[PDB]
Amino acid sequence: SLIEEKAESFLNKFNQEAEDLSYQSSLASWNYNTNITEENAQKMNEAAAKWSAFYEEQSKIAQNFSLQEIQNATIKRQLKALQQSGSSALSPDKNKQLNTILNTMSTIYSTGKVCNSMNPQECFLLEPGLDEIMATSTDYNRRLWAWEGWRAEVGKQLRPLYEEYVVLKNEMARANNYEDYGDYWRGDYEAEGVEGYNYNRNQLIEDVENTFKEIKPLYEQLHAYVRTKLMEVYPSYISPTGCLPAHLLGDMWGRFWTNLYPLTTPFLQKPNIDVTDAMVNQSWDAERIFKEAEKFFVSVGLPQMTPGFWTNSMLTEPGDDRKVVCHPTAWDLGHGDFRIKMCTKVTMDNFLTAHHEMGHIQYDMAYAKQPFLLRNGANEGFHEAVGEIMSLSAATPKHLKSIGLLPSNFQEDNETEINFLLKQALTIVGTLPFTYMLEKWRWMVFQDKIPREQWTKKWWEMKREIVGVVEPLPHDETYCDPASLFHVSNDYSFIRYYTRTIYQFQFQEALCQAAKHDGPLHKCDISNSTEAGQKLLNMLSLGNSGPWTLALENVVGSRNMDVKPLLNYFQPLFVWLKEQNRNSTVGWSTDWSPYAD
Amino acid sequence: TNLCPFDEVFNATRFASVYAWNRKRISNCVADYSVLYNFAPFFAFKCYGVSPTKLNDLCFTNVYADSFVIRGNEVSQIAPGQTGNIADYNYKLPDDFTGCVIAWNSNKLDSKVGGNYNYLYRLFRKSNLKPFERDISTEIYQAGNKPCNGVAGFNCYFPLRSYGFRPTYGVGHQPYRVVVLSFELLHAPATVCGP
Ligand SMILES: *[C@@H]1O[C@H](CO)[C@@H](O)[C@H](O)[C@H]1NC(C)=O
Ligand SMILES: [Zn+2]
C-alpha cells in the first residue's frame, strides 16, 4: 500500500549506494593483497570504515518500517536481513570492553610461545616447529611434553578471559531478542517462507543427533584399525581394550587423522596414483591446468570464464620484487568481475585446488542476477560442498585416462581403491565427531547449563564418551582446553563443516544418478552430461532469495539432510574393515587412564 | 551533391546523458548507408518498419538522430513496447516506431580508473514519460505524506544518480553508445533521398 512504495524506494537507493561502496572496498582489499605496503593497508582501512559506517546508518534508519505492515515475499526478506544488525544495541562501555577482550585473546593466541625445560634458548613457536613435530615424529615423550606445555600456556592465560567473554556475548545476544548466543548462531539455518518448507532453529540440534547415530557404526571400525597399528609403534602404552592417547593422533588437537597414513597404510607393495611425473615429462604450464579445468566445466554446459578473468586475475607467483601472502582464494569483487589468486605449481594438489576455486567462481557467477542483499549462498556449506564435489569428479582415474596423463592400457587394482577409500575416511570420518562434540560443548556452555566450575571435567568426560580420547595427564580446573583452537579463540562457528560434509555426498549421488552411471560410486564422473549441469544450475542461480529447503529439494529431492550417501560411498572400506578386524575387539571402555596406575 | 552529415552523430568526442539526450534534425541532403557501417562491432543493430537490407529508394521528409550513452544491460530496453527504468523514466519510444537503433561499445573512451561520474540517470519519477518527451527538472522527490519542503531526508530523495564507469567492470556494466534514427514523412516536399 502506502508503505510498500516507500520500502521499495528505500531499497532501491540502498542497493544503488551499496553496490559502489562494496566495489570500492573490495578493490582496495584486492589492491592491498596483491602488493603489501603501508599505503595499501591504509587505503584498505579507510575503504572499510566508510562501508561499515554506511551499513550502520542504513540499518539504523531501516527500523522505521514495520515488518508486518508490508507483504511482498521479496521486500520483507531484504528488510529483515538489513535490520538484523543489532551488534550495536549495547551501551558503549560494554562494547569497548568486549572489543578489547577479543583483541587480547586473539593477540595472546597469536604470540603463544613454549620453551624447553632442558634449554630455554630455543622457545619453539607454533608454525615453525610444533606442527612439524606433531605431524612427523615418533618419540612418545617429545609429543607428550609439547602437548602439555602448549595446553598449559594456552589455558592458564585464556580461561579468565573466556569466562567473561561468554557473559558479554550472552548479553549481546539477549539485547537482540534472542534466547542466548547459541540461538544467534543457529539463526543462520532457520528458513521461513512458503508452506511446507518451514524450518525452525531448535530442530537443527535434533537432526544432527540423528545423523551421528548412523556414523557411529563405521567410525568405530576405523578406531579399531588404527589402534592395533598404533600398538606396533608404541607397544607398552596403548591397550587393546582402551581409548587412544590425545597426543598420538597425529595432530596438535587431533582434528584430522591424515598424518597417520604412513603408519597405517594397508599395502606397501605399490604406491598411490600421482601424475606429477606425467606433467613434468609432458611440459605442462600453469595456464594449461586452468584451461583443462575450464574445459571440464564447459563439458557439462556451464558458462565459460569472462574475458577479464585471464587479464586481471593472477595465477602465478610474481617471482620478482613483489610481496604476496600465499593462499588460494576466489574473489567476487562485484560489478561483474571475478578473480582467482593462487601460487600455482606443477603438482596434482594445485590442479585440484584450481578445480575447487573454479567451482567457487562458477557459483558466484550463477547467483549474480539476484539483488545485493540476497546475493549469497543458501547456507554456509553450499560453496564448499560445490567445490568438494567438483574436485571429487575431477580426481577420478578415468578422467585422468581421458586427459592422457595415464596410459591407455591401465589395469586398475582393488587395493589402490581400498587405499584411496582409507585416505578419504581418515580425512572425513576422523574429523566429523570432533566437530560435533566441540559444537555441542559450546552450545551447552552458552545456555547457562554447564556450571562455571565443571568445564574441563565435563569436556574430557564427553571426549572420553563420544570420540574415545583419554587424557594422558590430569588437568586441574584452572586449565582451559577448548581455548587452544583457532575458531574458539577467534569467535567463529564450527558446524558448517559438518553440514558441508553431509551435503556434498548427497550432491555427488544426485549428479551421478543423473549422469547414467552404474557400479561403485567412487569411480563416477559428472563430465559429458548436460543433464547434471542443468540440475546443478537450476539451484546455483537461486542464491539467498528462498529457503534452502527448496534448493535442496531442487537438487536431490529431499526436504532434510541425510547421511546414507556417505555409507554407500564407503561401503567397500566398511566391508574390508570388518573382514580384517575379526581377531580384535570393537569399541572402547571409559575406565582406562594412562597416568592412573 | 550535398551529403547528409553523419559525422557529428557517429564521431562526436562527447555524448550527453540519458535524461538529456541529443536530438539532431536533418533534411534536404543526400543520405548514404555506406558511411553508417563505419565501426566493425555493431553490438546492436535493429530496425523496425524498414528493410534492414539496403533500401535507399524510399525518400523521407525529416530524419531525427537521437544520441546518448547507457549501460550494456539496458540496451534491450531501447525498444518499442518495453518496461523498465530507462524506458519508463528516461527515454520512451512509441509503438508505431519506424526507424533503427544502433548500439556499440565505448569502454576504451568512456572509462577511467578513478571513475567517470559525469554521466547521470533518473531513478525516481511521479508518472511515466510520454514518447519522445524529455525531463530535465531536479526537484526533490516526495514519496511520503509529510511535505518535503525543499530538503532531503527520510522519504525524501534526489532523482538523479551517476554511473561511475571503470575499466575492469564486466561487459554488462561497460559503457555503450546508442544512436536512434527516426524517419518522418509529413505533408511537405520530399527532401531526404539517396545518392
Ligand atoms: C573520426 O573517427 C576516427 C577515429 O579513429 C578518426 O578519423 C578521428 O579521430 C575522428 N574525428 C574526425 C575525423 O574528425
Ligand atoms: Zn573453498
Residue numbers in the entry:
A (entry chain A): 19 to 615
B (entry chain B): 333 to 527
Q: How does the study describe this entry?
A:
Receptor-binding domain (RBD) in the S protein plays an essential role in ACE2 receptor recognition, and mutations in the RBD affecting receptor binding and viral infection have been reported. To unravel the underlying molecular mechanism of the S proteins of Omicron BA.2, BA.2.12.1, BA.2.75, and BA.4/5 bound to hACE2, we determined their atomic structures of the S (BA.2, BA.2.12.1 or BA.4/5) or RBD (BA.2.75) in complex with hACE2 by cryo-EM or X-ray crystallography.
Compared with hACE2, H34 is replaced by Q34 in ghACE2, mACE2 and RatACE2. Notably, hydrophobic contact between residue L79 of the ghCE2 and I79 of the RatACE2 may also stabilize the interface.
